[PDB]
């Protein structure tokens, strides 16, 4: 056999079937005889490219396979990828590298030092000694993106690998199963669960991990059973909790005073599947008030080693979810008082409220819609007015890097063909990864675009305002029409200029056969 | 003085009056107070400010100025970055990092291990250990950027640095003068022009640090004294030597049997500002025939140590360009003859050959035009078909990373304002940094964009149906409409269908006041 | 050809005879039908072969080859590499990988990630992606460490390559000639020699790029002619000035203010292959006082830009002290009056004061002795109490990594075999890389190695007593016996215990037919 034939395989028998890419001629030796059982999702810029598998990814709680241009299409792709990193993204990412023979004079094309490229947004990165070690690196590459924690890698392979013979012994990759499904051993666990079933005014913070390992109705258990209310940890890329339950008390603000404010009094603060703490605004304080004692269980042992307080477990979220959901006492105690709903806006005949457009969303989406959000200066809002009862419903760049919510929405899209995807994306935002709207139409995945119209990048100009920042240039973006941008790439485009005009046009997207932008006016 | 106050001191003192951005949190308190007598550019995604940036870098001849928003604004630059490097462009990349206080959490926005992320791609990559650092990590940056050889690096600064008091002793930076504008000593010089006047049929081959160090006219002198014939080195980035002139011989093809084959019967074969060479496609053979010896004057020690073959000379190629230039003889052999004419490819009334476009913008655009190439397949008849007089008047992606001719065209015609420029894009390329049309369209920026719609990527079809790849996915990109994305983003847009058609179009954009698209409709 | 035998071609063709090694498994088929043209030199740890083959590069003034195994034997030699990257030093580091086909496993002595490993001490860094491309990698090593700045390079080769068949047309490899022999053009180099024309108070600082490039006694001519004084710039790695000449004002201390008050009253400074400045101690100040303007040419892009004042121009030492020394008018001022010689201190029958070693070695040691200096505390009258008339007569570790001088003392006495070397060490620093000593013996390279004993790292006391750092652990290293350890390693081995014995014990030395080590009880 080939390097192709034994890589595609491997690929299979290891449940990938998806490549998502954007092709150059490096990889023409790769992507030649294109297995037919295989599809390959093309998008028209990297950024996009690895967006769209990021989406999948997340979704399906699985592996994606990307494949890029050489030195220039991963480095196109690398703000991308620093998102996949924040989001503990399982990502194979693969390069195509000039020939073996043309590498050392740096032809065109010669991805140069090609392993420290993508450094320091993954993993692992290498380039193969060798073609017949391309099946083995590529093995590699597929375990080390799916071991927890989870996260992008990098494999550049010169073109001429790909038809040289490959190791008969490389039959023995093809159905290896790596487990990291692991949680604490019982004696340590039993002094866990005592000290949770002991704790008078117990909290649970839960993070995006949650959601990635879709342990949320474990979570749900368990904050049942202890009586305590549920935050979600700051800065959140996931929604780990129904948001109407009863224990939920919504996103912590991204401050350290703010948390150990919002943490006094509760004794014993669990923490799951989260960075301890993804702050973003300086906020200095106290990280914890006296009284207060965290416990954080993470799937990464670099998030474990950087919180500033409180002991830590490294282990499977999934695997721990499930394990104290099920050992710990039902507390006496009361069940915590749902959230009241939130105020209803003061709406006129004019521009949206961004408050406006979340209610009506909530209104009128599918209980089981997928919401993303690249709306920055309206993710508190959001929060507060969508109704999540399901996993999965919820993606924001985790690592604030903009460009990710309009291709991430046609790969969760593709994942999740049953459930509404619903981007709500800011006129800044949308820009970053505009292209990405081709692959929607081209491929009929019917993800319905949101885009908050107001003329500005809001969250910066409150960023501003705030340090009383004067002076400030690039605030403002006017000038875009985008529904002559969704037209360049064949979606269908709505506008809505007031309330009458945001249902109506909610109502065709609902309804409609493929991808739909609606371009909302909202106020400055 | 403030960090602040000193480092615009230090910018405005060594030239640099612009900034090109996409700004971020972590960079409101540099741009916060931006000095009136600074200019920002601003644009909407990050592989367009440096595409923007580095077009003004070429084309200015002098260091262009970046600020980006921490990891995931640099990301998203990194295939910009990698043309930037190829191109040896002059490119100060500064980006925001987190607060100190926070960078150890890890808190949103913190750019993790920041210097090694932009690496492999920059000659200098750095955050400083202190905020009173800032302004000599600057004075290191610039001048890093400005000597031979030039190219990109990158600088990451904690937002509470701006505001800490500077140190006095700062002053020393402002004026320092660093000159790299060396060449051979004389003793060694004179033993290379004596080679060149004993040569019987001498060559040269010019690559794009000669049109950077407008070295154009002492080469041009320099041909002509030695009667010889001259190439420009494959993958062109640039173009060194007025193509109507006696002596010029074309692109060369980037093969290395065609190479050696080219220059078969020259003695002497003289490259000034080219790597040796930047080959493309694999095309075996011998580096040079029997009888041929080659010298290269190069800027570039990397590229020095990596010839495959011949003597090679690190040196600035502006001062070296001049002193051979006045040193040699005046050979007694005959001028070279000048290449014919192009021949006119037959065209009927329906859609365009390249050829027929090429040969329509050479008769109608101004003689001082500046033509950009992002039009992959067609590089050879446009090489062919444009009389380009003049130095500046070529840009073509230096790493053949997609997505630099649409903003670099922007950033050309802002440094050129009296020089007409115009892109020649692909449909498949257009798409990378389509979004830099708003620029143009809002800073008034009347670069000319001449989109060659043939509906797939020609180049890559052509580098398959080579290797007899079959099965290839991904080679399509139908169903984008241009004139709809630069109605997006305000451009004046125009379709052009047949010849009657584009000559109408082009008369129109020749005269506008702004930036024009024309949707160019060529044969598959 | 083979691989091996094309390589070893290159390297001889190259000026290449020497192999400076520690040898592994990894290195067998790169040693085995070792040239009878070549010669191997066995040292008994990596950090030993690299500081013999630094000497031996830097008194030679040619680059040197080292061939070391794996990661284990690279990492060995890393302190090693830090002061050769300090002082420019033409090293070709090369290292042993496992054999292609078990890398992907990471065997045993698999080096991972190989080229990062040496990094960021080196000047290139690179594995080849084939074993026909090994030729071209060692070619781009020779000419990376050759070209300005010099410095050392790496090149890690998997094991099967060396018995591959080479590419026949790496024959084009082996007379490369590549040349960075550069200076200022004529119109900048003659502004620069008016401004030195028309100082009224000129001072001339040297570097030890002076010494490397043999410009010592061009700045002889240059300093006479302008009638200035010399001082050498801090933290000197070389000598570059005959330190008895009448201009000569010795060593410059290693601290910003007291450099800046040295050169108060001197309009000009010019500054010839060294950094500004490579300082210590903290001694905040001004960098230079009003009233003094800084000229510094430099081989070395990274010095000239991180330099906190003055201008700087990028060229090569030689050329540049050549061109200026010829170019310069004879100033009418009065020839600076030489240094009064250095007081003798009072010395009594019992322990040796430093003082009295060097003066007593000055006495006794021929006049084109030379000296390294690895004697940490007492290196400022080791500056005053030497007469070092020649070049090449002075070396010590470049970036203060002690274990430099033994070893680097062989590498020197076998680069000079007509000149005796006397390194005097540290009681402390001989340990670092003691086993250098066998070499020596083994191959009969006479050099003197003198051990000033006071029982404690000298340099650190003071370095504390200054800070007034109190209860600090570690200083002391008693009970070392130095003879023992000579005679461990077959070196013929003294003792100087006062005054009568110190001359009794050089008078043999001087004598010896081999190398001597001198074991000196120096006061505490
Ligand atoms: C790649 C990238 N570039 C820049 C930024 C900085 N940034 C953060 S929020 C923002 C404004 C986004 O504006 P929009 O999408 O219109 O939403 P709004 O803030 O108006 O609600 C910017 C530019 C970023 N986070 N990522
Ligand atoms: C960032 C990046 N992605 C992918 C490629 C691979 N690539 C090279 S040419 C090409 C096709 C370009 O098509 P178009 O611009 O329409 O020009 P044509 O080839 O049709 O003339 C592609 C995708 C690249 N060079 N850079
Ligand atoms: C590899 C290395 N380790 C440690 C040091 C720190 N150091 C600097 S001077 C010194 C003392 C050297 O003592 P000795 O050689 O006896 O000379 P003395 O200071 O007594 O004159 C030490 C440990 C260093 N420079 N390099
Ligand atoms: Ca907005
Ligand atoms: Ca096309
Ligand atoms: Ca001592
Ligand atoms: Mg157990
Ligand atoms: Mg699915
Ligand atoms: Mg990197
Ligand atoms: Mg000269
Ligand atoms: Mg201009
Ligand atoms: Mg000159
Ligand atoms: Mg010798």
Redesign the pocket.
């Known amino acids: 056999a080939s390097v192709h034939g034994t890589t595609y395989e491997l690929l299979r028998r290891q449940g990938i079937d998806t490549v998502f890419g954007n092709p150059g001629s490096n990889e023409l030796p790769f992507l030649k005889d294109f297995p037919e059982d295989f599809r390959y999702i093309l998008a028209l810029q990297e950024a996009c490219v690895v967006g769209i598998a990021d989406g999948y990814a997340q979704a399906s709680r699985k592996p994606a396979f990307i494949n890029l241009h050489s030195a220039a299409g991963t480095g196109n792709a690398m703000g991308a990828l620093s998102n996949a990193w924040n989001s503990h993204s399982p990502l194979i990412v693969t390069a195509g590298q000039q020939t073996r023979a043309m590498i050392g004079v740096e032809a065109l094309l010669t991805n140069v030092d090609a392993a420290n490229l993508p450094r320091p947004l993954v993993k692992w990165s290498y380039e193969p000694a060798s073609a017949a070690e391309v099946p083995h690196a590529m093995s590699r590459a597929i375990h080390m993106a799916s071991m927890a924690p989870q996260g992008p890698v990098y494999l550049s392979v010169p073109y001429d690998d790909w038809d040289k013979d490959a190791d008969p012994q490389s039959h023995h990759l093809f159905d290896r199963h790596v487990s990291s499904s692991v949680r604490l ?3 340590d ?1 039993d002094i866990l669960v005592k000290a949770l079933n002991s704790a008078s005014n117990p909290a649970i913070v839960l993070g995006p991990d949650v959601d990635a390992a879709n342990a949320n109705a474990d979570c749900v258990m368990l904050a049942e059973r202890l009586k305590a209310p549920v935050w979600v940890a700051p800065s959140a890329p996931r929604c780990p909790f129904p948001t109407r339950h009863p224990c939920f008390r919504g996103l912590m603000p991204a401050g350290i005073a703010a948390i150990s404010q919002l943490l006094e009094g509760h004794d014993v603060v669990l923490v799951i599947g989260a960075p301890v703490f993804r702050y973003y605004q300086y906020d200095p304080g106290q990280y914890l008030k006296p009284g207060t004692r965290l416990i954080s269980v993470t799937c990464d042992p670099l998030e474990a080693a950087r919180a500033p307080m409180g002991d830590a477990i490294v282990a499977d979220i999934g695997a721990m979810a499930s394990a104290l959901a099920n050992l710990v006492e039902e507390s006496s105690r009361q069940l915590p008082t749902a959230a009241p709903e939130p105020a209803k806006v003061d709406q006129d005949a004019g521009r949206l409220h961004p408050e406006t457009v979340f209610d009506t969303l909530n209104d009128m989406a599918p209980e089981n819609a997928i919401y993303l959000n690249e709306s920055t200066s309206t993710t508190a809002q959001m929060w507060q007015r969508l109704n999540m009862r399901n996993p999965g419903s919820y993606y924001f760049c985790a690592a604030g890097g903009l460009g990710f919510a309009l291709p991430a929405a046609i790969g969760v899209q593709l994942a999740e063909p049953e459930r509404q995807v619903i981007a709500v994306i800011g006129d800044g935002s949308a820009n970053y990864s505009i292209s990405a709207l081709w692959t929607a139409a081209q491929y009929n995945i019917p993800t319905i675009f949101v885009i908050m119209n107001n003329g500005t990048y809001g969250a910066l100009r409150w960023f501003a305002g705030v340090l009383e920042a004067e002076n400030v240039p690039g605030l403002d973006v006017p000038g875009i029409d985008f529904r002559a941008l969704a037209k360049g790439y064949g979606v269908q485009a709505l506008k809505a200029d007031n309330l009458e005009q945001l249902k109506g046009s909610l109502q065709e997207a609902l309804s409609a056969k493929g991808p739909v932008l609606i371009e909302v006016s909202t106020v400055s």
Do not use: G, R
């Open positions: 051993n019982d004696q666990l």
